[PDB]
Short mmCIF file of N, CA, C and O in Angstrom, two decimals:
data_model
loop_
_atom_site.label_atom_id
_atom_site.label_comp_id
_atom_site.label_asym_id
_atom_site.label_seq_id
_atom_site.Cartn_x
_atom_site.Cartn_y
_atom_site.Cartn_z
N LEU V 107 105.79 -34.08 -24.44
CA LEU V 107 106.82 -34.72 -23.43
C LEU V 107 106.45 -34.47 -22.18
O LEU V 107 107.50 -35.26 -21.51
N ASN V 108 105.24 -34.28 -22.14
CA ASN V 108 104.60 -34.51 -20.75
C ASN V 108 105.34 -36.15 -19.62
O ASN V 108 105.58 -35.64 -18.84
N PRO V 109 105.39 -36.82 -20.49
CA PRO V 109 105.07 -38.47 -19.46
C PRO V 109 106.50 -38.32 -18.77
O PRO V 109 106.59 -38.24 -17.62
N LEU V 110 107.61 -38.04 -19.53
CA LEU V 110 108.80 -37.61 -18.76
C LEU V 110 108.54 -36.27 -17.84
O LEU V 110 108.66 -35.39 -18.99
N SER V 111 108.86 -36.36 -16.79
CA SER V 111 109.35 -35.18 -16.04
C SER V 111 110.21 -34.67 -16.94
O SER V 111 111.63 -35.28 -16.92
N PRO V 112 110.41 -33.28 -16.61
CA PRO V 112 111.47 -32.61 -18.04
C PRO V 112 112.61 -32.94 -17.19
O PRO V 112 114.17 -32.99 -18.23
N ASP V 113 113.07 -33.56 -16.01
CA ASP V 113 114.46 -34.10 -15.21
C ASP V 113 115.52 -35.06 -16.14
O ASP V 113 116.26 -34.64 -16.72
N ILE V 114 114.09 -36.06 -16.75
CA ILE V 114 115.03 -36.99 -17.65
C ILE V 114 115.35 -36.71 -18.61
O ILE V 114 116.49 -37.39 -19.24
N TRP V 115 114.77 -35.72 -19.20
CA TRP V 115 115.18 -35.45 -20.56
C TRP V 115 116.84 -34.86 -20.82
O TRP V 115 117.52 -35.65 -21.41
N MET V 116 117.16 -33.85 -19.65
CA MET V 116 118.40 -33.48 -19.91
C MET V 116 119.48 -34.37 -19.26
O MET V 116 120.43 -34.38 -19.58
N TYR V 117 118.95 -35.33 -18.57
CA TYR V 117 119.86 -36.44 -18.25
C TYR V 117 119.99 -37.22 -18.91
O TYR V 117 121.34 -37.82 -19.56
N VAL V 118 119.47 -37.57 -19.89
CA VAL V 118 119.86 -38.24 -21.41
C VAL V 118 120.34 -37.75 -22.42
O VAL V 118 121.46 -38.40 -22.90
N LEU V 119 119.94 -36.44 -22.30
CA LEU V 119 120.88 -35.32 -22.87
C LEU V 119 122.65 -35.32 -22.51
O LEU V 119 123.40 -35.78 -23.57
N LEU V 120 122.71 -35.51 -21.44
CA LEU V 120 124.13 -34.92 -21.19
C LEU V 120 124.86 -36.88 -21.13
O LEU V 120 125.86 -36.85 -21.33
N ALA V 121 124.29 -37.79 -20.96
CA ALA V 121 124.18 -39.27 -21.07
C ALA V 121 124.62 -39.77 -22.53
O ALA V 121 125.77 -40.20 -22.66
N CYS V 122 124.06 -38.99 -23.41
CA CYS V 122 124.24 -39.56 -24.55
C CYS V 122 125.78 -38.60 -25.40
O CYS V 122 126.65 -39.22 -26.04
N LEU V 123 125.76 -37.41 -24.63
CA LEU V 123 126.60 -37.02 -25.21
C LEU V 123 128.24 -37.58 -24.29
O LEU V 123 129.04 -37.29 -25.01
N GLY V 124 128.31 -37.73 -23.46
CA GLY V 124 129.17 -38.39 -23.00
C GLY V 124 129.64 -39.57 -23.12
O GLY V 124 130.57 -39.82 -23.69
N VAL V 125 128.47 -40.80 -23.52
CA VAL V 125 129.20 -41.96 -24.66
C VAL V 125 129.06 -41.91 -25.51
O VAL V 125 130.11 -42.77 -25.66
N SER V 126 129.00 -40.69 -26.76
CA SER V 126 129.52 -40.63 -27.42
C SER V 126 130.59 -40.13 -27.70
O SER V 126 131.95 -40.65 -28.00
N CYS V 127 131.11 -39.33 -26.52
CA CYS V 127 132.18 -38.94 -26.16
C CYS V 127 133.64 -39.90 -25.91
O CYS V 127 134.61 -40.02 -26.60
N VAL V 128 133.10 -40.67 -25.27
CA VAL V 128 133.72 -41.95 -25.09
C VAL V 128 134.16 -42.60 -25.70
O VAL V 128 135.38 -43.54 -25.97
N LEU V 129 133.20 -42.86 -26.61
CA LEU V 129 133.01 -44.05 -27.50
C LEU V 129 134.22 -43.09 -28.92
O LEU V 129 135.04 -44.14 -29.46
N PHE V 130 134.27 -42.14 -29.09
CA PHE V 130 135.20 -41.00 -29.97
C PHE V 130 136.71 -41.84 -29.40
O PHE V 130 137.67 -41.78 -30.09
N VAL V 131 136.64 -41.38 -27.92
CA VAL V 131 137.73 -41.32 -27.26
C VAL V 131 138.64 -42.93 -27.34
O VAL V 131 139.38 -43.42 -27.90
N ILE V 132 137.77 -43.90 -27.10
CA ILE V 132 138.20 -45.37 -27.42
C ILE V 132 138.24 -45.70 -28.81
O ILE V 132 139.44 -46.48 -28.92
N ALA V 133 137.66 -45.50 -29.60
CA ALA V 133 138.13 -45.66 -31.24
C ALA V 133 139.22 -45.03 -31.63
O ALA V 133 139.78 -45.66 -32.44
N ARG V 134 139.54 -43.90 -30.80
CA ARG V 134 140.57 -42.94 -30.98
C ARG V 134 141.99 -44.43 -30.63
O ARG V 134 143.03 -44.32 -31.30
N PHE V 135 142.19 -44.76 -29.76
CA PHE V 135 143.16 -45.72 -29.27
C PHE V 135 142.92 -47.40 -29.59
O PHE V 135 142.79 -48.29 -28.46
N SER V 136 142.33 -47.77 -30.91
CA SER V 136 141.88 -48.88 -31.51
C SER V 136 142.37 -49.67 -32.43
O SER V 136 142.92 -48.90 -33.42
N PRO V 137 142.92 -50.75 -32.50
CA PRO V 137 143.89 -51.28 -33.34
C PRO V 137 143.28 -51.29 -34.36
O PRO V 137 143.95 -50.84 -35.84
N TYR V 138 142.27 -51.98 -34.40
CA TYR V 138 141.56 -52.31 -35.85
C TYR V 138 140.61 -51.69 -36.85
O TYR V 138 140.72 -51.59 -38.11
N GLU V 139 140.54 -50.30 -36.21
CA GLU V 139 139.77 -49.21 -36.53
C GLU V 139 140.30 -49.08 -38.02
O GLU V 139 139.58 -48.47 -38.94
N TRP V 140 141.84 -48.54 -37.73
CA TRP V 140 142.27 -47.89 -38.94
C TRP V 140 142.28 -49.06 -39.90
O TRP V 140 143.12 -50.13 -40.01
N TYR V 141 141.27 -48.65 -41.39
CA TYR V 141 140.85 -49.54 -42.43
C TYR V 141 140.99 -49.61 -43.63
O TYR V 141 140.13 -49.82 -44.59
N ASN V 142 142.55 -48.82 -44.19
CA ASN V 142 143.05 -48.52 -45.18
C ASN V 142 142.26 -48.57 -46.16
O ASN V 142 142.01 -49.67 -47.10
N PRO V 143 141.15 -47.53 -46.30
CA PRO V 143 140.49 -47.81 -47.22
C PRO V 143 140.29 -48.08 -48.75
O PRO V 143 141.72 -47.99 -49.05
N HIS V 144 139.74 -48.80 -49.54
CA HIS V 144 139.70 -49.82 -50.53
C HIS V 144 140.84 -50.49 -50.26
O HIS V 144 142.08 -50.22 -50.84
N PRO V 145 140.64 -51.72 -49.06
CA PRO V 145 142.00 -52.56 -49.47
C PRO V 145 141.83 -53.62 -50.75
O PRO V 145 142.51 -54.24 -50.98
N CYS V 146 140.97 -53.48 -51.35
CA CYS V 146 140.88 -53.87 -52.74
C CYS V 146 141.80 -53.77 -53.73
O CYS V 146 142.07 -54.79 -54.76
N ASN V 147 142.84 -52.49 -53.15
CA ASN V 147 144.13 -53.14 -53.73
C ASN V 147 144.86 -52.41 -52.55
O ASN V 147 145.01 -51.30 -51.99
N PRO V 148 145.53 -53.62 -52.02
CA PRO V 148 145.79 -53.72 -50.81
C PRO V 148 147.73 -53.17 -50.81
O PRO V 148 148.32 -53.18 -50.01
N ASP V 149 147.52 -52.35 -52.10
CA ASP V 149 149.34 -51.79 -52.61
C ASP V 149 149.95 -51.59 -51.03
O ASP V 149 151.21 -51.51 -51.54
N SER V 150 149.29 -50.76 -50.46
CA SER V 150 150.23 -50.24 -49.26
C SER V 150 149.41 -50.06 -48.20
O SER V 150 148.16 -50.46 -47.63
N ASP V 151 150.13 -49.96 -46.72
CA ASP V 151 149.63 -49.97 -45.77
C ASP V 151 149.35 -48.39 -45.05
O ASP V 151 149.61 -47.70 -44.51
N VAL V 152 148.40 -47.84 -46.15
CA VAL V 152 147.84 -46.45 -45.78
C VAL V 152 146.60 -46.64 -44.66
O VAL V 152 145.87 -47.40 -43.98
N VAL V 153 147.21 -45.74 -43.36
CA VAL V 153 146.63 -45.74 -42.16
C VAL V 153 145.37 -44.85 -42.15
O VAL V 153 145.97 -43.51 -42.81
N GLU V 154 144.17 -44.90 -42.27
CA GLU V 154 142.84 -43.76 -41.92
C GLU V 154 142.45 -44.09 -40.79
O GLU V 154 142.74 -44.92 -39.95
N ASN V 155 141.13 -43.28 -40.50
CA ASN V 155 140.32 -43.14 -39.35
C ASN V 155 139.26 -43.54 -39.54
O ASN V 155 138.64 -43.41 -40.45
N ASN V 156 138.37 -43.56 -38.12
CA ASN V 156 136.95 -43.80 -38.12
C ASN V 156 136.54 -43.08 -37.05
O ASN V 156 137.24 -42.83 -36.14
N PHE V 157 135.18 -42.78 -37.12
CA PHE V 157 134.69 -42.85 -35.67
C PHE V 157 135.14 -41.66 -35.03
O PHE V 157 135.54 -41.23 -33.93
N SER Z 61 155.02 -43.43 -28.41
CA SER Z 61 154.86 -43.31 -29.59
C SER Z 61 153.43 -43.35 -29.96
O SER Z 61 152.87 -42.67 -30.92
N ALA Z 62 152.63 -44.54 -29.90
CA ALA Z 62 151.38 -44.52 -29.72
C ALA Z 62 150.35 -43.62 -29.38
O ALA Z 62 149.34 -43.17 -30.36
N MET Z 63 150.64 -43.13 -28.40
CA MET Z 63 149.71 -42.50 -27.94
C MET Z 63 149.79 -41.14 -28.52
O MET Z 63 148.67 -40.37 -29.00
N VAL Z 64 151.23 -40.46 -28.58
CA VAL Z 64 151.25 -39.51 -29.88
C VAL Z 64 150.92 -39.38 -30.93
O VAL Z 64 150.14 -38.88 -31.36
N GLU Z 65 150.88 -40.77 -31.65
CA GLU Z 65 150.50 -41.05 -33.22
C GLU Z 65 149.29 -41.22 -33.31
O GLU Z 65 148.64 -40.11 -33.42
N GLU Z 66 148.35 -41.44 -32.30
CA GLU Z 66 146.81 -41.74 -32.21
C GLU Z 66 146.11 -40.59 -31.51
O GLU Z 66 144.65 -40.28 -31.62
N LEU Z 67 146.72 -39.75 -30.84
CA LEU Z 67 146.34 -38.40 -30.19
C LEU Z 67 146.58 -37.43 -30.99
O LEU Z 67 145.53 -36.47 -31.09
N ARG Z 68 148.14 -36.95 -31.32
CA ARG Z 68 147.69 -35.67 -32.28
C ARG Z 68 147.21 -35.66 -33.50
O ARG Z 68 146.46 -34.91 -34.19
N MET Z 69 146.72 -37.07 -34.25
CA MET Z 69 146.00 -36.97 -35.31
C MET Z 69 144.73 -36.76 -35.28
O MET Z 69 144.05 -36.59 -33.79
#
């Protein structure tokens, strides 16, 4: 792990944790992502979640 | 209602 001076490491640590959290937040308020698992029987508007 | 629905869930 020498090539990157240890600083950049934990920087990217916090970076990906933040981007993942904001991904979860955005997918939370997302229209199409509620994806009614097995629409192959469309019998009802079942609302499920992702991400 | 939408913020409540997708927030509490």
